[PDB]
Design a protein around this ligand. Structure first.
Ligand SMILES: *[C@@H]1O[C@H](CO)[C@@H](O[C@@H]2O[C@H](CO)[C@@H](O[C@@H]3O[C@H](CO[C@H]4O[C@H](CO)[C@@H](O)[C@H](O[C@H]5O[C@H](CO)[C@@H](O)[C@H](O)[C@@H]5O[C@H]5O[C@H](CO)[C@@H](O)[C@H](O)[C@@H]5O)[C@@H]4O)[C@@H](O)[C@H](O[C@H]4O[C@H](CO)[C@@H](O)[C@H](O)[C@@H]4O[C@H]4O[C@H](CO)[C@@H](O)[C@H](O)[C@@H]4O)[C@@H]3O)[C@H](O)[C@H]2NC(C)=O)[C@H](O)[C@H]1NC(C)=O
Ligand SMILES: CCc1ccc(OCc2n[nH]c(=O)n2C)c(Oc2cc(C#N)cc(C3CC3)c2)c1F
Ligand SMILES: [Ca+2]
Ligand SMILES: [Cl-]
Ligand code: NA
Ligand code: NA
Ligand SMILES: [Zn+2]
Length: 804
């Protein structure tokens, strides 16, 4: 209940939220149906429109006008944004040459440059180039400020998950807005875009920027605008707040446009109808910049022009129907569209079975435009699993398509030509970033980066300490002129042991055999040197990874590779090796097919054994440093050490062998040498974080050998490919993957074909940031390069997408 009989007189767009049942006058009151009786009259004036004309100049103030052109409007702070242009011979900001803003140029009483976040819904990255002719204001921000050619949104590429990621620096699984639609089973409550339900605090985790600012004594304008407030009024309100006195004035502001997303859904991303919406956004930007210019703030304010997601071509006829797949279609609930989420229709139905639903959805039709996953099997780069609101069964839908339950859902709900939501690496989903102002760089292009990184920089821009978040603070220092955040490398927690030869062959009873009894002071001093690390600068090119948790591990050196071997998990945490352009691939000799060799540096009790793999009918093994890439027949023996062995399902060994035999060498050819760091990942609780030993759900049968959920590789080389990977003077180039360790290749519909037809496709889908591998392993990579730490942080956030 609201006592709407109070008044908005002198309260229009007040910053405090007034408590029920007293009537509100804030930019949220419309959404709560709680505005005072006179809110529209007083706070939503429209009389005479939004622009000054010559004949209004020097008018007598008339308080009913939307905005003013009277001589007193500047001190009142309520001129039309074009007042100075029309009435005072000034130029529009867009017509002014851009000139570097070397220092903030702020009016007295401004303690720091204010930040204005201009957020646009559905603004696809390619609009910056393709619409540049109709967006002169936005083109000026982009060209004169700092811009990325695109910015990567988060999955799902939907509005609220992405806006709240911008706000919090968190993945949707952590902030809680995991879709525009959600069921929370703990609260037994549903989230929808309609009504006031979405406003309930329980949906929104983490700490958004406006709360971060408030808690630390920086005042914030309100980030949510009711849909019925016109954009001209949003801009006027922000400009009015900016003329508040010092003590009362916010330092951070947000504007929001529902366009171009609204039209894009109707017309498709490049419908001819889309030019108008783009012009209109540009005009709104021009209003803001003109208004800042009037207030003498245009060389003071940092402006961020930022999108939430793009827009793809999607039409009703491109829908897959679960009714064509499932017999039981009425026993499921489906969240539909550009992603699918499935759960049981009724939690009383114990004939519900995820295993049979998944199997009925898997490679059933030759052109099938979606792929089913248990959420833990989704590419780790998506970070879309660790929340009770994410259903176990997920459908990744091909770009340009929808999934729906039954045909009737689509015609009793073509009425649309655009949509978004797809995998966040899809080009049509990429969105925009431009920063303009004293703290941003001048005329600077920066590589694409992920929207999860922005919260940190927004905190930097405002002098705030960010709340714990998923950005990597310092990874975007290259966007900034000043206010950089200079992180230190984390300290190593566990120091390695360096074991020498400590065990005789006969102390081992591993049930392994090797035909290795095939054997000089020339060639033995040499082998000893290798085992002492004489070739380590070749194979360990960026220093040893630091272990950031308490554990017990051994550094093991070899001619061809170096490893950090965990006595806890009985396998390497990491294995590092360099493969030059000239390296040659060989096979595993016939006599060495089943060769496994005890490592005389490591006790029996801290070794795997071959009996375990013989007895486990589901589990085989592979090796981390590939025997195929041995530098000599004698070196090959090192590759068969029990300390280089890792448990692998036969199905996964298909993938791994092809990567090791064929791809590594292909990457070395193309990249002029690669350095490879490979290892296991244990994430049984799918939280994106290294499991502790007591979190492991599966072992090689009868043993203490833990089964990895994933295997990773980090493949580094010289960004200037004229330099070989092992003699690189400059910046580095990286690609990584985190391949799921699965007992079948059901994910790959073409997997009965030759590995050359499907394995690299799998790998690309499981592309990763080095940073994702750091979280999953507790390791810190690139500790010793000649590069700046911020640059290394940027490298670590890099994602190789394979989009064109
Ligand atoms: C991306 O960035 C974020 C932020 O840095 C990372 O998330 C952090 O990860 C930490 C580890 O997972 C986690 O730490 C835990 O905090 C628990 C206290 O939780 C509350 O307080 C925080 C701080 O303000 C708050 O943010 C939390 O908010 C969560 O929950 C609310 C309501 O449910 C949501 O609104 C909100 O969205 C958020 O949910 C998300 O996280 C939770 C987990 O917190 C998930 O359940 C959701 O799926 C969702 O993703 C909370 O209100 C604390 O209790 C934990 O401590 C346990 O474990 C340690 C082990 O060292 C031990 O000392 C304790 O004994 C304790 O164990 C006891 O409880 C166990 C579990 O019930 C039980 O089994 C034991 O027997 C014990 O009794 C833990 O320290 C931190 O909360 C989050 N922060 C956020 C914001 O999500 C994220 O990891 C990053 N991702 C990647 C990939 O890098
Ligand atoms: C850059 C970060 C950012 C910018 C703009 C944001 O909304 C802008 C917005 N106006 N009107 C509208 O329909 N939309 C989506 C935003 O989302 C929210 C902000 C607040 C607040 N305060 C509250 C909510 C939930 C719905 C109740 C969401 C957001 F996080
Ligand atoms: Ca984990
Ligand atoms: Cl959704
Ligand atoms: Na076996
Ligand atoms: Na298959
Ligand atoms: Zn949309």
């Amino acid at each position: 209940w609201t006592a709407t009989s109070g008044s908005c007189k002198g309260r229009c767009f007040e910053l405090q939220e007034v408590g029920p049942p007293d009537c509100r006058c804030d930019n949220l009151c419309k959404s709560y149906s709680s505005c005072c009786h006179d809110f529209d009259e007083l706070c939503l004036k429209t009389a005479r429109g939004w622009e000054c004309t010559k004949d209004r100049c020097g008018e007598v103030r008339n308080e009913e006008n939307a905005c003013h052109c009277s001589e007193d409007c500047l001190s009142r702070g309520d001129c039309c944004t074009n007042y100075q242009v029309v009435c005072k011979g000034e130029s529009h900001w867009v017509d002014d040459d851009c000139e570097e803003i070397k220092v903030p140029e702020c009016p007295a009483g401004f303690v720091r440059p204010p930040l204005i976040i201009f957020s646009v819904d559905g603004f696809r990255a390619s609009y910056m180039k393709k619409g540049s002719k109709v967006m002169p204001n936005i083109e000026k921000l982009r060209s004169c400020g700092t811009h990325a050619p695109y910015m990567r949104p988060v999955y799902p590429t939907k509005t609220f998950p992405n806006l709240y990621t911008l706000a919090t620096g968190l993945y949707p699984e952590s902030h809680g807005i995991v879709g525009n639609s959600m069921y929370d089973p703990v609260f037994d409550a549903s989230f929808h875009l309609r009504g006031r339900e979405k406003f309930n605090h329980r949906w929104w985790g983490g700490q958004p920027l406006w709360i971060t600012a408030t808690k630390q004594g920086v005042r914030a304008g309100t980030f949510f605008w009711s849909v019925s407030i016109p954009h001209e009024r949003r801009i006027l309100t922000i400009l009015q707040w900016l003329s508040l006195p010092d003590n009362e004035r916010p330092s951070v502001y947000a504007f929001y446009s529902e366009q171009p997303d609204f039209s894009g859904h109707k017309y498709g991303p490049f419908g001819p109808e889309m030019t108008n919406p783009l012009r209109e956004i540009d005009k709104t930007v021009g209003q803001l910049m003109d208004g800042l210019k009037q207030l003498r703030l245009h060389r003071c304010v940092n402006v961020i022009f930022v999108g939430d997601h793009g827009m793809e071509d999607v039409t009703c006829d491109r829908t897959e129907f679960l009714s064509n797949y499932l017999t039981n279609v009425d026993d499921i609930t489906l969240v539909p569209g550009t992603l699918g989420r499935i759960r049981a229709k009724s939690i009383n139905n114990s004939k519900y079975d995820p295993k049979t639903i998944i199997a009925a959805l898997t490679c059933k039709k030759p052109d099938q435009h979606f792929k089913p996953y248990m959420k833990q099997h989704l590419p780790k780069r998506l970070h879309y699993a660790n929340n009770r609101r994410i259903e176990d069964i997920h459908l990744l839908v091909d770009r340009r398509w929808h999934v729906a339950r039954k045909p009737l859902d689509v015609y009793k709900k073509c009425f649309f030509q655009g949509d978004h939501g797809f995998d966040n690496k899809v080009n049509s989903m990429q969105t925009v970033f431009v920063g303009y102002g004293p703290t941003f760089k001048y005329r600077t292009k920066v590589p694409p980066f992920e929207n999860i990184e922005l919260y940190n920089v927004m905190c930097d821009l405002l002098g705030l300490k960010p709340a714990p978040n998923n950005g990597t603070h310092g990874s975007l220092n290259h966007l900034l002129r000043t206010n950089t955040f200079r992180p230190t490398m984390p300290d190593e927690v566990s120091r390695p042991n360096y074991p020498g030869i400590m065990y005789l062959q006969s102390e081992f009873d591993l049930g392994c055999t090797c035909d290795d009894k095939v054997e000089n002071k020339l060639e033995e001093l040499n082998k000893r040197l290798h085992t002492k690390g004489s070739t380590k600068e070749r194979h360990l090119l960026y220093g040893r990874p630091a272990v950031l948790y308490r554990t017990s591990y051994d550094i093991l050196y070899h001619t061809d590779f170096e490893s950090g071997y965990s006595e806890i998990f009985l396998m390497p945490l990491w294995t590092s090796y360099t493969i030059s352009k000239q390296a040659e691939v060989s096979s595993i000799p016939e006599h060495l097919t089943n060769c496994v060799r005890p490592d005389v540096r490591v006790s029996p009790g801290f070794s795997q054994n071959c009996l375990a793999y013989k007895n486990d009918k589901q589990m085989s093994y592979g090796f981390l440093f590939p025997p195929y890439l041995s530098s000599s027949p004698e070196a090959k023996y090192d590759a068969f050490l029990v300390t280089n062995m890792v448990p692998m399902y036969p199905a996964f060994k298909r993938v791994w062998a092809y990567f090791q035999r064929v791809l590594v060498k292909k990457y070395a050819s193309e990249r002029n040498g690669v350095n490879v760091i490979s290892g296991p990942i244990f994430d049984y609780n799918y939280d994106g974080l290294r499991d502790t030993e007591d979190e492991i759900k599966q072992y090689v049968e009868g043993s203490s050998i833990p089964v990895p959920t994933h295997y990773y590789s980090i493949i580094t080389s010289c960004l200037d490919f004229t330099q070989p990977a092992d003699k690189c003077d400059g910046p580095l180039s990286v690609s990584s993957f985190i391949l799921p360790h699965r007992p079948d290749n059901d994910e790959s519909c073409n997997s009965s074909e030759d590995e050359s037809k499907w394995v690299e496709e799998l790998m690309k889908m499981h592309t990763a940031r080095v940073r994702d591998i750091e979280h999953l392993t507790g390791l810190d990579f690139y500790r010793k390069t000649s590069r700046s730490y911020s640059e290394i942080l940027t490298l670590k956030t890099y994602l190789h997408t394979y989009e064109s």
